[PDB]
RNA sequence: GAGACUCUGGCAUGCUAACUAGUUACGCGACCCCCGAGCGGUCGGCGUCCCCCAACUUCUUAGAGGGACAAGUGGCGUUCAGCCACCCGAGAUUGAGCAAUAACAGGUCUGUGAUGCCCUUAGAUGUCCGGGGCUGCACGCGCGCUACACUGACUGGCUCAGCGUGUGCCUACCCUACGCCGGCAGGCGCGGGUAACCCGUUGAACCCCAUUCGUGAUGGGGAUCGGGGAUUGCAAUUAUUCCCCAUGAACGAGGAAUUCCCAGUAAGUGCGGGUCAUAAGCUUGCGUUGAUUAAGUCCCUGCCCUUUGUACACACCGCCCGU
């Protein structure tokens, strides 16, 4: 058998694959910025 | 002897300049940390081959789509 | 010492390695010099690197020979240092010149290859680089003195020294004459 | 009728186990004769060799 | 048997969950099942069918 | 599946910390006493003196993170994939470990209380005891040890490692300092060690420096055979190992043929572990001295891919024609 645990749980074990790989996505590398002076 | 790179180190690199080409520019030890920042690799020198197949790709990015 | 090098005694300068074929593979007259025989010796990775060593140091590597005596160095310098002592002796004269003299005659100039004509034994004659002609020199000297020396009264440092004057000047009665002669009568024949 | 002459590229091996090589040469005294021949042992462009047979004109083996 | 003195040792039956990832107890299950004259072929399925249902 | 992955090796004066791996500078806190010099300072030292309030960098101590990625450069290239020579530096890298689908009537019922079926079972193929043999010799085959000498053998003096193991075992047992006696077989006394704290700075060989020998089957070589000593055990004959005197054979680099191998590799040299009441010409690891030749190819032996041809399919160790 050969178990799912690739990431953490409960417990984890010895985490991923050596080739298995995840990347995250940004949500935010737009940023159309101007001189606005917002202090706060 | 010889080195080729796989398609494990290739679609990744495709990847994330796909995402994230304005992090990145021409130097390899900038390129190796952000790398490392936003994406998570199980070893060191997956980290380092990927990289270098990154830098060696932006340099043709610069010119010729 | 800053300005020469020696073996301790003799010189590597007033010297002439006399050729031009024979020239960019033998480091005895250039003034990157050595005070001795072996260093670590790096010089076996590469293809090409093995033209950069010392010729007295190609000499020293290839006496330890025929399994009684492998890695003995300092036995075999012992060899050198009282073999070019004696060639003093002899003639009075520096023997770095008589070891080129002999090196630089004693490679053969042709050769046949074993082209059998897919299994059809037949030859035909060929030329021969420089590197081989150094090779072929050295392994057929230090191929004399031995069997020279191996049921006798006489050692090694004799030996080796008679069969190197012998070279040196076309004597026509040392091993290494007598061979090149042969190789030569052979690719003429089948030429 | 001892000669020399100077190498000035390889072309490639040769023989039933790839031990002789095809050269190019020019004579080191008139420099637009030529000719090519075949070698035994390791050699590199930048040589120079002791020809006997001044011309044989060799060709593939 | 291990003559480990009197009182020096002390025993705790276990529930286990996850029946369907360990092999041990499917290995178990599947002698039994064989020994009483089952099909082979019925019983294969059976086991690999409840495995892949419990995740791996 | 290959790759990725694990272990090991190679680098850091950067971090971490140390008598149970353990020093090295200072004080010499002592060296002993002159321990030498010398009329003195100065040099010298490996262990011997401690609690452990005089540093840890450099061995082995061992954890973390770092570092190398064809990254910079010149050429070559469908200017893609990538390749060659170079700048700094370790530039593909010692290396191993793990290992797919389908299979072989491969081997193992003498590894198993893993097991079918057959055989036997009180005058036993069970299970104990006494002795013997598994080693017997007109011949053939293979894996290896020693040597055929002077680049050497003998006799004295100098000088350096590393992997390891070690006392009470499931049914029976350690590594050894120091002394006293004799060459060893040794043998008596006391000590240490459940271990880098004791053996132990594991004072190893080959090497190195000097005497004897001088081409003489010779002092090379050490089979064979006689005699005497001791040690293990209940027991040494068919000599089980070890020591001493004498004995002194074949062998002058080996025909046809054939094995292994290109970087700390081959080869030489000897230390440990396994077996072990008694023990290594074997195997498994370890260091130590340290070469020649290549950097290529399909000619001999074999492997992979495509195209082709076939009267083969237990598959050319095939099928098959006539007298």
């Known amino acids: 058998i050969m178990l799912p645990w690739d990431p953490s749980g409960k417990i984890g074990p010895k985490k991923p694959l050596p080739d298995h790989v995840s990347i995250v996505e940004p949500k935010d590398e737009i940023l159309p910025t101007t001189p606005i002076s917002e202090q706060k | 002897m010889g080195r080729v790179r796989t398609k494990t180190v290739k679609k990744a690199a495709r990847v994330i300049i796909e995402k994230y080409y304005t992090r990145l520019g021409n130097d390899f030890h900038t390129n190796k940390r952000v790398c490392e920042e936003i994406a998570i690799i199980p070893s060191k020198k997956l980290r380092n081959k990927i990289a270098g197949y990154v830098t060696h790709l932006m340099k043709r990015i610069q010119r010729g789509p | 010492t800053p300005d020469i090098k020696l073996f301790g005694k003799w010189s590597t300068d007033d010297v002439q390695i006399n050729d031009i074929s024979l020239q960019d593979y033998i480091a005895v007259k250039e003034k990157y010099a050595k005070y001795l025989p072996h260093s670590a010796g790096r010089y076996a990775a590469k293809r090409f690197r093995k033209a950069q060593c010392p010729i007295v140091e190609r000499l020293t590597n290839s006496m330890m020979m025929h399994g009684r005596n492998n890695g003995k160095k300092l036995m075999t310098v012992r060899i050198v240092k009282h073999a070019f002592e004696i060639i003093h002796l002899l003639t009075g004269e520096n023997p770095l010149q008589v070891l080129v003299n002999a090196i630089i005659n004693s490679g053969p100039r042709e050769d046949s290859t074993r082209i059998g004509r897919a299994g059809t034994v037949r030859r035909q004659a060929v030329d021969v680089s420089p590197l081989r002609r150094v090779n072929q020199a050295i392994w057929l000297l230090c191929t004399g003195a031995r069997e020279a020396a191996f049921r006798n009264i006489k050692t090694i440092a004799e030996c080796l020294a008679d069969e190197l004057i012998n070279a040196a000047k076309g004597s026509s009665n040392s091993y290494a004459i007598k061979k090149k002669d042969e190789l030569e009568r052979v690719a003429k024949s089948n030429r | ?61 | 048997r291990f003559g480990f003195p009197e009182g020096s040792v002390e025993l705790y039956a276990e529930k286990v969950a996850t029946r369907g990832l360990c092999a041990i107890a499917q290995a178990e299950s599947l002698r039994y099942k064989l020994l009483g004259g089952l099909a082979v072929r019925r019983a294969c399925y059976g086991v690999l069918r409840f495995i892949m249902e419990s995740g791996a």
């Not at chain 4, 031990?19 to 040469?25: A, K, L, S």
């Open chain 4, 1 to 61: 009728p001892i000669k020399l002459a100077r190498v000035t590229k390889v072309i490639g091996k040769t023989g039933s186990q790839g031990q002789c090589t095809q050269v190019r040469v020019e004579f080191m005294d008139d420099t637009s004769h030529s000719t090519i021949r075949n070698v035994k042992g390791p050699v590199r462009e930048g040589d120079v060799l002791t020809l006997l047979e001044s011309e044989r004109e060799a060709r593939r083996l």
